[PDB]
Amino acid sequence: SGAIYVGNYRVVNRHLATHNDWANLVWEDSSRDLLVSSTTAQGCDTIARCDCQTGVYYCSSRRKHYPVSFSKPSLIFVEASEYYPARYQSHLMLAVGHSEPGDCGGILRCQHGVVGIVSTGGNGLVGFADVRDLLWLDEE
Ligand SMILES: Fc1ccc(C[C@@H]2CCCNC2)cc1
């Protein structure tokens, strides 16, 4: 689990979005595993605006932060988890690292702020849904 809180926005994995998230839907993309809902309380997170390929992610299944090198956001085929089947995901970044289902929502961060959230895993890789393209998260 886990979310990003920036202004009046909550960013979550689309597959973990709550009834409240969907009731206050701002934007969702099934291909990206992202949903943004509106919040009454102002969030304090900063979204990274950059093309860093290094950062640190929180891995709840190890209660540890790991430094990783990660690929630029791409269209990637993802093999069978349990929440999703096998299928294709856009704006996805991979690193070598530990990821289990419940690690989704772990934040990946660089010096510039939040890069993305854990979204996929398995075969010794971790996949992160990029948010750095969502410039609109930084206003109203
Ligand atoms: F009125 C409402 C409000 C939110 C949901 C959305 C949830 C999301 C998970 C799947 N069950 C539905 C439905 C109806």
Ligand SMILES: Fc1ccc(C[C@H]2CCCNC2)cc1
């Ligand atoms: F998890 C992290 C990782 C790094 C920073 C800090 C910056 C500044 C020092 C070098 N670049 C990184 C913040 C949160």
Ligand SMILES: [Zn+2]
């Ligand atoms: Zn950066």
